[PDB]
Amino acid sequence: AVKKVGKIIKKRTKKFTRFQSNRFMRVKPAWRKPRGIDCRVRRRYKGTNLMPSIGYGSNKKTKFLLPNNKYKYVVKNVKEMEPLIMNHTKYCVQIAHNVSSKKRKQIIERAKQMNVSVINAKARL
Amino acid sequence: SHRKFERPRHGSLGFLPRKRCKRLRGKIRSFPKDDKEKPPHFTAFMGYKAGMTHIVREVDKPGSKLHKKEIVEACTIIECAPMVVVGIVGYRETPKGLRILSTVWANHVSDEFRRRYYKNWYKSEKKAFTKSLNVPEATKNCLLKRIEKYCTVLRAICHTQPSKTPLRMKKAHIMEVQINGGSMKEKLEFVKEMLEKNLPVSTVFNPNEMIDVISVTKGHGTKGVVSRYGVKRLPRKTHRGLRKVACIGAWHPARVQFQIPRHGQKGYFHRTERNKKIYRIGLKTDKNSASTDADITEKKITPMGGFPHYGVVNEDFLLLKGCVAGTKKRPITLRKN
Amino acid sequence: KTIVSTQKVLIPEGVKVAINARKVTVSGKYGTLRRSFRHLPIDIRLNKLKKYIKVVMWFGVPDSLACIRTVCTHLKNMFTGVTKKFLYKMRLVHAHFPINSNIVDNNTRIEIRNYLGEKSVRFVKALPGVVIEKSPNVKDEIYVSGADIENVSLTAALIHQSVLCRNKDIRKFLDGIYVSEVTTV
């Protein structure tokens, strides 16, 4: 069903799974459109693995923003934080996975004094 | 398509499943219908198959090829030491069948009877039936009065005395014999006056009387279809053996029917044969049990050397015309017609 | 579908009747008859001081209307039977083998022998309230009497049907017991 928090409405949860991936190990759950001929899912038989459509698209006014109602931006050092100084209340910052504890403390403190929220603030400590 | 040549099926479907019987003891499925007019009387008895012999009798069948001539007939000997009556059970009719109201025991029961309640009597404390028997007589009379008022079928618990037989078994075979006769008032007193004393066979049965026999047939383990159902042997050229049923069903239904003979257990089946005539009720006391007025010899029923695989019959017995199901030492329940 | 249809039955002198919920009871000098009509939709108006009973049906289709006269005739048969016993005279006819009839059990359970020389006893038990005897005038006659027309007639039919011949030309082997006449006492 639809999920609605604040103004952000997510039109569908529980991401689509590939047909028959439940009962075949070689078939990964990642969605693939089934070509088939008599394919059930392709023909849209009721009660079987509905396919993604453009109609599920979230509205463009609130498309990419996180539950904190702002867009995420992934940074790798303190230098890539400069553009956030202007839109600190529209963007949250996430530190890249391959950033060391050297630099993570620096990015955390810089974002703190920049007044921009950090997503994975308590990582690697 | 149809069979080229029809012939009746093999074996009776009425004795299915040909599985092993639950118990070694013959169990009466139903007792004869109650007749109010007749006086109260017992209906069944228990004995043991001692073996068989043959007798000579003069036929009195006019217009028959035998008539006045003397005939040899096979006869089964069933040793019947007196049974002991120990209990009364009352039944009442409900739309769900017969319901026990209660059972009333006698003041004393034999150790032979109590053994039947134990799997390991030798190591047991033998505490069964030890403190339920000294109940006050007032409650006894109350239970009998309620049985009189409400019950409509009366049976007496009675047990055999294997110690009087050559059996290795020591625990008694116990069973309920239904009392058929007058009203419950008379039935209750008829059983109460016999609530502890011995029950001889002569009380239950008379000579020259037709009775039914209930017993478990002789066991044979698992047997092939040829022996078990009497199917015809396949020709000698058959590839994977000839002692089997060739076709065990048509293509459809795509199953094997339950009417198809198959290998399995043979023997040790419960059976109830009708119309066995009592030829003589031999008594323990007399020494001429096997003597006739045309023989006047001094001899008892036991053949010289003893009954094979059984022993010596030192108690009451009845000479039954024909054969009866079961091996030697098998408990046979005799039922009134 | 007619609105109301009635028919009237006179009550004879020596009879006393009682009708409750179309359950009629008739009493006379020859016994008592008791009949139930609860399988028909009818009002039974019993008038005692002026005799007669009227059977009236409302909204009767012809199939149901056919039963009014049936009920009335049943009632008048009850009256006649209770005032003068219904009598069925039967005749025993035989070609070569005389039929030996024996009446036992205080005029019930007649037994028949020598039917076609079969020397096997046949017998019929009279229905309740029915008496079988032999006529004192004609030697091959049987009287079946009683208050209930249905009972006596059924008993006579039982006598007749107990003695049918088998595997022979029925129109040549005429022997048997036949209802010669039906009257009253």
Binding site: - | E93, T94, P95, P253, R255, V256, Q257, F258 | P41, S64
Partner: protein, 201 residues
Amino acid sequence: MYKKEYVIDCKGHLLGRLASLIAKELLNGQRIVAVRCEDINISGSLYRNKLKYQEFLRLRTNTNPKKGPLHLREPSKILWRCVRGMLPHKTYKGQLALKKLKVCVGMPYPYDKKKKYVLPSALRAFRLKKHRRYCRLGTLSSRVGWNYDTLVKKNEVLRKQVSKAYYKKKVNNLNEKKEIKTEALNLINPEQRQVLENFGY
């Protein structure tokens, strides 16, 4: 529908209509107990219904009749099977609805002492024209092989006697209570009296 359980007297009730009403109640989560199931009526002649049951009886699985349609002969079981056939018994909810039903022949110990209800929408007197044949489920079951009809009749006449005694005692108690009321009604205040007789108490 809103009681802990409904005890209904099946005497003089048409089998199919009664089963339909019972099934709807059970599906709505109402526990019912059907008593005197051997007095259920069925439209159509006794011979016709006997023929129908013989056709049912002739029906068994050829391979192994143990698995076949268990035929059942008690009128209570017949009513139970009719209700089951009127019910989605192969689902969990349908199974619960089926098990919420109890059927008896006669009136046993708990149910002979509680109020029995009647469904007028299924009464023979209201649903069958008086000139058309009907059957009695008890006699049908007896002809099919129930062989417990007469015993139920005996138990029923005994229950009739005890119920008659109870009813006489209850009538005496109600009469004496009404006599108490008509006199104690003069001892209350007059305006209380006026209210009571105005509203018919």
